[PDB]
RNA sequence: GCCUUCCCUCAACUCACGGCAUCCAGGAAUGAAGGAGGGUAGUUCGGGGGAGAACGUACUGGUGCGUCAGAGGUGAAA
């Protein structure tokens, strides 16, 4: 088929970048290269209304269309990299994390070697805000 | 306790005895304050100060390699 035919009957390790924020959730597909990709999924496609595009439901509904497209790319095993937010944002992911993982596991994809890959500064620029804060 | 004898006074000059040759005023000042100043030493002690050279990720932008439809953002939106 389109996917494995020289890696077939053997697990293949993709990589999945998960970026969870409070405006959307992203689920991306990479192959231990990051130079080539197959699919880019956003919460906002599956669920409409901007509040609910970062909600748990968004994640899970999106996650099932990861699995759908992975089994056509020969990908079976998935390494995962969880990302929070920017280095001048916070250090907290949105609610779309922890939802996506479970949705993939339950959908028969293997998961191993999860990691925390996020941009944390040694130090960076003045954080957005003010001296007196947002109020 | 003391005298004498005996061992018999070491740091390259040290100890004992003698010649006589020299040079030539000099030691008579209160003390050293849990008062001040200074010296020396531990390659002491420290986000102390100046200079010069590298290092770290992030933010932002650009470039290249891929993907494809929404993304920013909010209480909700725009």
């Amino acid at each position: 088929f389109y996917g494995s035919s020289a890696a077939k009957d053997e697990l293949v390790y993709g990589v999945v970048h998960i970026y969870a924020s409070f405006n959307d959730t992203f689920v991306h597909v990479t192959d231990m290269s990051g130079r080539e990709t197959f699919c880019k999924i956003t919460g906002g496609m599956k669920v409409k209304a901007d509040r609910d595009e970062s909600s748990p439901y968004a994640a899970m509904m999106a996650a099932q269309d990861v699995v759908a497209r992975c089994k056509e790319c020969g990908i079976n095993a998935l390494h995962v990299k969880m990302r929070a937010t920017g280095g001048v944002g916070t250090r907290s992911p949105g609610p779309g994390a922890q939802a996506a993982l479970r949705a993939l596991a339950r959908a028969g994809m293997k998961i191993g070697r999860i990691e925390d890959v996020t941009p944390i500064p040694t130090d960076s620029t003045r954080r957005k805000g003010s001296r007196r804060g947002r109020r």
Side-chain angles (χ1 to χ4, degrees), chain A residues 22-104:
Chain A
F22 301 89
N23 294 286
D24 198 54
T25 302
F26 301 148
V27 190
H28 189 54
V29 179
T30 39
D31 302 297
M32 302 188 298
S33 299
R35 294 297 194 91
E36 78 301 302
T37 53
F38 286 115
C39 200
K40 176 63 182 65
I41 300 176
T42 53
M45 287 157 62
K46 312 301 172 184
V47 180
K48 299 295 181 179
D50 303 303
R51 182 177 183 183
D52 302 304
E53 297 182 358
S54 48
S55 63
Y57 187 53
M60 303 186 75
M61 292 294 287
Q64 299 299 313
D65 299 294
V66 181
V67 184
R69 181 58 181 186
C70 283
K71 296 184 181 297
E72 299 298 299
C73 292
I75 309 300
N76 297 303
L78 293 169
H79 301 314
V80 178
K81 287 177 169 59
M82 298 179 72
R83 189 165 292 105
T85 44
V88 293
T90 55
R91 295 181 177 177
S92 298
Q98 306 174 312
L101 285 71
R102 176 176 175 150
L104 293 169

